[PDB]
């Protein structure tokens, strides 16, 4: 007879109810299971009724794989899932945190910290629209973005994934969600999930909650703050995500006053679901439940019990799915976990899939392939790269002539630094590889290339990664652009207590600037010790992690546009002042939050 859930003309809730009612325990626990493609098989997906797959950082089909290759990989897994008794489509997730960053040829936008410096929410929303298009270009339908953590300590390896230390700014930047998922109807009830159609993707507000407030900025650590502060600083943006219909929420590895978020029923169920009335689905982080215990995994049984009872709906195992499914099954069969907990979880997961139209469009659209790296997206990224730059100095003394903007026509100029012609360094973490990489890892324009593409034909451009003072003094240069900074890094690898850039960096700038007026471009994912650099430079710009479009940097350096960016964070004098954010008692910053010198287009 008529199968309600397969009828695309019926209300979502009706379809969810109808489907849930036909599911066996194995099929329900299956929807709650997300596995890495690396361990996925047509059989595994089919026999285990897997409800979701994902690519962790760097998990790709081949290096340099095309958009069709991705589409073919996803469709391949989907066909397996579509062959199950019920034919429930799987949802594929990936970290498109600044463009479809794992994919070769994808547009790499500036990381979040730089986007906050723009103070332009509409721009960010536009990036979310381009990102969605480029993710769908590879056949993926779910992006683990945006990270709305409010980084309160630069020493945190993930501080560049935070728009700012000021919740008010992070709240405003949640416009990425409507960009990725599409605008919600005027009626829309806050808390409901939403995705416009096959050209949009499900989003994910992460990492619930307070992930940006751990002590000393130690990643995945403990966040010590009273409930007033947790709600005043780290919770706000989530309420905005609710109003904008974010489809999912990822739980943080971090703890709040000693309690693991992956096991906090009060926050996940009591607050996020019951209070904010989130109706989408809550997903864990990579082995998130494993790390509830210490050692991690030392008691997987407890991990599953605690996380599921806490309220989580879908688990990112992401490898040992047999162990996960087996253990959860046992608990349900034994009454440790009620069917209502399972049904609730499966209800939310199915609601999201039906709402985004997954049952109507389970497969990739080949016509979307060309969205990947579309020039207009790169132009957008270029605009964002430019708008994110923060000019911290433009002249050694009050009477000096402003070095910037630089003339496009000069007899001979010098471009130097470890970051002047290194695309990988320019993009930072989460680019091609998980921890990011060095060199020409994808399609883009480095600072050097951008310079060569901007100057007048008569302008000779010389490149020298690390020239000694002599080479510069006798080079006959009119001026120099030196680029130095941090190396790509992600998560814990990023935790840093000294926050000083790797060498050669300062030495190159001191060598170059000592020989000719220089404009230093600082590539970093957060504020770093900068007094020495300032001392040697005539002009210094904080470019953060610009992305693949280096011309955005030269668009400001040469005057095609004036600098407009303002600090999204506080720039400290020394690391032992930290923590130290705006509104603090001992606020003694080198540069207040909101600081930024400006220039006018020539
Ligand atoms: C302030 O604290 C931080 C700690 O977070 C510290 O940085 C870390 O230092 C670790 C050593 O104690 C280092 O671990 C070793 O890394 C080796 C490989 O390192 C290279 O490759 C990784 C992988 O991409 C990069 O992240 C590194 O930056 C490094 O990259 C090379 O660096 C050189 C020198 O700058 C450069 O010329 C190369 O071109 C560049 N190549 C690449 C790959 O881009 C391993 O082989 C070894 O087994 C250890 O694991 C950490 O990687 C590093 N963290 C990061 C992300 O930088 C920092 O230390 C300073 O900086 C490092 C790079 C090194 O030069 C130290 O001597 C220097 O002191 C510390 N600063 C202070 C004030 O001490
Ligand atoms: C926040 O981070 C600190 C680390 O900076 C965590 O404390 C550290 O916890 C580990 C184990 O969890 C301790 O490691 C040692 O491991 C060996 C290996 O078996 C064991 O035999 C030792 O007895 C010891 O456990 C480490 O000593 C400890 N270090 C500190 C600074 O106390 C802390 O648990 C983290 N908190 C959260 C909420 O994540
Ligand atoms: O790879 C997927 C996930 O990996 C985890 O390690 C990170 O904490 C998440 O932000 C990310 O979405």
């Amino acid at each position: 007879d008529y199968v309600l859930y397969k009828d695309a003309t019926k209300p979502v809730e009706d379809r969810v109810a109808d489907l849930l009612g036909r599911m066996t325990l194995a099929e329900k626990i299956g929807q709650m299971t997300q596995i890495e493609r690396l361990v996925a098989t047509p059989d595994v997906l089919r026999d285990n009724f897997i409800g979701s797959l994902l690519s962790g950082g760097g998990s790709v089909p081949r290096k340099g794989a095309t958009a069709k290759e991705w589409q073919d990989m996803v469709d391949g897994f989907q066909k397996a899932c579509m062959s199950t008794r019920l034919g429930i489509p799987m949802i594929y997730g990936i970290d498109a945190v600044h463009g479809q960053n794992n994919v070769y040829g994808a547009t790499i936008f500036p990381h979040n910290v730089g986007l906050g410096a723009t103070r332009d929410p509409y721009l960010v929303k536009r990036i979310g629209e381009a990102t969605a298009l480029e993710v769908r270009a590879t056949g993926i339908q779910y992006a683990f973005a945006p990270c709305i953590a409010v980084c309160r300590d630069p020493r945190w390896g993930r501080c560049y994934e935070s728009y700012s230390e000021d919740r008010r700014i992070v709240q405003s930047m949640t416009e990425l969600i409507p960009g990725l998922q599409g605008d919600v109807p005027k009626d829309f009830t806050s808390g409901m999930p939403f995705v416009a159609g096959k050209n949009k993707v499900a989003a994910c507000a992460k990492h619930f909650v307070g992930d940006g407030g751990t002590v000393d900025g130690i990643n995945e650590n403990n966040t010590i703050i009273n409930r007033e502060g947790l709600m005043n600083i780290h919770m706000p943006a989530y309420k905005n995500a609710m109003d904008k219909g974010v489809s999912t929420v990822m739980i943080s590895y971090s703890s709040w006053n000693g309690v693991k978020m992956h096991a906090n029923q009060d926050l996940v169920t009591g607050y996020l679901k019951d209070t904010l009335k989130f109706k989408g689905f809550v997903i864990s982080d990579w082995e998130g439940i494993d790390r509830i215990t210490t050692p991690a995994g030392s008691d997987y049984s407890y991990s599953v019990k605690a996380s599921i009872l806490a309220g989580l709906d879908m688990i990112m195992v992401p490898n040992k799915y047999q162990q996960f499914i087996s253990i959860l099954t046992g608990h349900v069969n034994g009454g440790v976990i009620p069917m209502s907990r399972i049904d609730d979880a499966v209800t939310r997961i199915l609601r999201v899939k039906f709402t985004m139209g997954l049952f109507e469009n389970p497969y990739a659209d080949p016509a979307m392939a060309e969205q990947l790296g579309k020039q207009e997206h790169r132009d957008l990224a270029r605009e964002a790269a430019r708008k994110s730059l923060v000019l911290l100095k433009n002249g050694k003394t009050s009477t000096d002539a402003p070095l910037l903007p630089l003339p496009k026509k000069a007899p001979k100029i010098l471009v130097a630094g470890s970051h002047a012609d290194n695309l990988g360094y320019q993009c930072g973490g989460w680019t091609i590889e998980w921890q990011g990489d060095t060199g020409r890892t994808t399609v883009g324009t480095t600072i050097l290339e951008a310079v060569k593409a901007a100057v007048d034909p008569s302008t000779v451009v010389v490149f020298a990664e690390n020239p000694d003072a002599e080479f510069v003094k006798s080079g006959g240069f009119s001026y120099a652009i030196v680029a130095v900074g941090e190396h790509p890094y992600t998560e814990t690898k990023g935790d840093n207590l000294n926050l000083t850039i790797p060498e050669p960096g300062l030495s190159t700038v001191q060598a170059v600037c000592g020989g000719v007026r220089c404009a230093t471009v600082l590539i970093s994912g957060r504020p770093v010790v900068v007094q020495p650099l300032l001392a040697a430079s005539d002009a210094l710009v904080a470019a953060w992690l610009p992305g693949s479009e280096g011309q955005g940097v030269t668009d400001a350096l040469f005057g095609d546009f004036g600098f407009t960016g303002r600090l999204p964070r506080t720039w400290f004098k020394s690391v032992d002042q930290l923590p130290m954010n705006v509104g603090d008692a001992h606020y003694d910053p080198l540069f207040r939050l909101g600081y930024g010198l400006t220039t006018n287009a020539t």
Side-chain angles (χ1 to χ4, degrees):
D1 61 313
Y2 170 72
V3 180
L4 194 295
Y5 85 80
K6 287 182 184 298
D7 187 328
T9 81
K10 317 293 294 192
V12 169
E13 301 303 305
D14 291 315
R15 298 180 72 185
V16 164
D18 190 76
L19 179 55
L20 184 58
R22 309 162 183 272
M23 302 170 75
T24 65
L25 176 56
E27 293 165 329
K28 294 183 181 183
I29 289 180
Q31 283 301 305
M32 304 171 65
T33 308
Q34 183 186 73
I35 64 183
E36 230 286 343
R37 49 164 285 274
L38 288 178
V39 306
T41 273
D43 286 307
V44 175
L45 297 174
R46 190 185 299 107
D47 304 335
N48 289 291
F49 306 113
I50 301 301
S52 176
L53 281 86
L54 94 158
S55 279
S59 192
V60 305
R62 290 193 316 158
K63 273 298 182 57
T66 70
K68 290 285 161 43
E69 292 184 63
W70 281 86
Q71 277 185 32
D72 291 340
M73 178 192 79
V74 179
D75 286 331
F77 295 137
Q78 189 68 287
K79 274 182 193 172
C81 299
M82 288 308 283
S83 69
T84 56
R85 186 180 68 107
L86 301 173
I88 305 185
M90 63 82 222
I91 185 168
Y92 201 107
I94 188 166
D95 288 294
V97 295
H98 65 151
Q100 176 63 311
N101 52 70
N102 273 134
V103 178
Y104 178 81
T107 300
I108 307 301
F109 297 88
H111 268 301
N112 286 354
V113 65
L115 294 185
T118 69
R119 295 300 199 299
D120 192 326
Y122 181 55
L123 170 67
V124 177
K125 177 180 175 177
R126 270 149 62 223
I127 292 175
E129 316 190 317
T131 295
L133 285 173
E134 284 198 49
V135 166
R136 279 292 190 170
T138 63
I140 296 175
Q141 325 94 323
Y142 174 31
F144 300 132
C147 165
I148 53 174
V150 181
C151 172
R152 296 244 101 194
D153 199 304
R155 291 172 294 182
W156 184 39
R158 314 195 71 171
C159 208
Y160 68 75
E161 296 194 67
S162 171
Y163 296 112
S164 171
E165 63 184 56
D166 182 333
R167 42 88 94 171
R168 287 174 298 175
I169 293 178
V170 178
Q171 300 186 70
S172 74
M173 295 303 134
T174 60
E175 275 294 287
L176 185 85
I177 296 175
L180 289 169
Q181 309 188 319
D183 296 306
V184 305
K186 182 163 294 182
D187 52 70
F188 199 68
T189 296
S190 172
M192 286 294 273
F194 183 79
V195 181
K198 64 201 191 74
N199 298 128
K200 293 298 187 178
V201 303
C204 176
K206 65 186 188 179
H207 310 79
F208 191 80
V209 68
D211 51 324
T214 61
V215 25
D216 295 354
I218 303 173
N219 190 211
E220 301 185 22
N221 214 247
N222 189 27
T223 298
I224 302 177
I225 187 172
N226 60 50
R227 180 175 159 107
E228 305 286 303
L230 188 287
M231 304 290 260
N232 174 57
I233 305 170
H234 308 107
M235 192 66 74
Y238 279 100
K239 171 61 182 186
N240 302 77
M242 299 291 110
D243 298 338
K244 296 173 188 180
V246 66
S247 296
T248 71
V249 174
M250 183 178 299
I251 304 300
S252 176
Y253 291 123
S254 56
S255 301
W256 177 44
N257 293 316
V259 180
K260 291 289 189 177
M261 280 304 306
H262 284 263
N264 190 319
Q265 185 192 67
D266 283 309
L267 294 171
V268 173
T269 294
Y271 197 66
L272 175 61
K273 289 185 176 184
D274 299 335
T275 307
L276 294 182
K277 290 180 176 179
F278 175 53
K279 261 59 174 74
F281 72 75
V282 179
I283 190 176
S284 75
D285 205 328
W286 187 276
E287 307 180 317
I289 72 177
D290 299 57
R291 302 175 196 181
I292 287 179
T293 67
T294 128
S298 73
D299 190 347
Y300 205 60
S301 179
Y302 173 67
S303 293
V304 184
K305 181 182 170 187
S307 60
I308 296 299
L309 291 176
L312 287 66
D313 312 308
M314 180 185 290
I315 301 301
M316 191 173 127
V317 190
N319 301 308
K320 305 176 294 173
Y321 58 82
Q322 189 179 319
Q323 183 178 58
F324 175 70
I325 299 179
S326 192
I327 288 177
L328 181 47
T329 298
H331 287 173
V332 177
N333 285 342
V336 178
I337 297 180
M339 264 301 306
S340 59
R341 187 61 271 292
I342 299 303
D343 290 339
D344 171 62
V346 186
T347 290
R348 292 155 171 296
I349 294 176
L350 291 178
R351 178 180 292 114
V352 183
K353 292 188 171 179
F354 277 118
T355 302
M356 69 177 91
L358 247 203
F359 291 69
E360 280 62 72
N361 296 287
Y363 301 104
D365 182 334
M368 295 290 276
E370 303 218 306
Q371 282 305 301
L372 189 66
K374 202 171 74 186
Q375 195 53 53
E376 290 86 340
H377 303 351
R378 289 179 187 289
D379 294 327
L380 172 60
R382 184 166 168 178
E383 181 191 324
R386 180 253 305 182
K387 294 190 183 182
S388 72
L389 309 175
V390 174
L391 184 63
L392 294 176
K393 183 179 173 186
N394 194 29
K396 291 193 171 180
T397 88
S398 66
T399 54
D400 276 35
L403 172 62
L404 304 181
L406 293 165
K408 295 184 184 178
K409 187 176 188 174
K412 188 177 186 184
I413 69 173
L414 180 67
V415 169
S418 56
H419 293 54
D421 187 51
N422 191 321
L423 190 55
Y425 283 11
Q426 186 177 311
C427 297
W430 292 108
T431 312
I432 302 306
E433 291 305 328
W434 174 47
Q435 289 296 309
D437 209 337
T438 182
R440 180 155 252 66
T441 64
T442 189
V443 173
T445 309
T446 66
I447 287 173
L448 172 54
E449 295 175 292
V451 174
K452 291 184 173 178
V455 296
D456 177 284
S458 64
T459 299
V460 176
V461 184
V462 178
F463 174 60
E465 200 177 319
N466 276 282
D468 50 49
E470 210 172 78
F471 171 99
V472 184
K473 290 212 195 71
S474 40
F477 297 117
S478 304
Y479 62 73
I481 297 171
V482 192
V484 295
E486 295 188 296
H487 291 181
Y489 59 74
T490 311
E491 299 182 59
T492 300
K493 267 282 188 172
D495 286 354
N496 197 315
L497 291 179
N498 64 63
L499 289 188
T500 73
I501 62 177
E503 284 302 299
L506 173 50
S507 65
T508 307
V509 167
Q510 299 177 320
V512 177
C513 302
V516 60
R517 45 176 180 166
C518 68
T520 292
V521 178
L522 182 58
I523 300 296
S524 65
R526 57 193 159 186
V528 288
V529 184
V530 70
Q531 285 102 324
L533 281 169
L534 252 16
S537 312
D538 297 293
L540 181 150
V541 184
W544 314 109
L545 300 170
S548 56
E549 308 311 306
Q551 299 175 75
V553 173
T554 51
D555 279 343
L557 285 179
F558 290 111
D560 291 326
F561 297 85
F563 290 84
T564 54
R566 298 200 235 87
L567 296 183
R569 305 199 58 73
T570 292
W571 206 297
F572 52 75
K573 298 186 182 178
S574 59
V575 294
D576 42 42
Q577 291 182 298
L578 305 170
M580 182 171 97
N581 310 77
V582 202
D584 263 20
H586 75 140
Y587 205 56
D588 184 28
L590 182 71
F591 290 112
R592 301 219 197 66
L593 170 152
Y595 179 97
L597 297 179
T598 76
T599 55
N600 284 131
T602 69

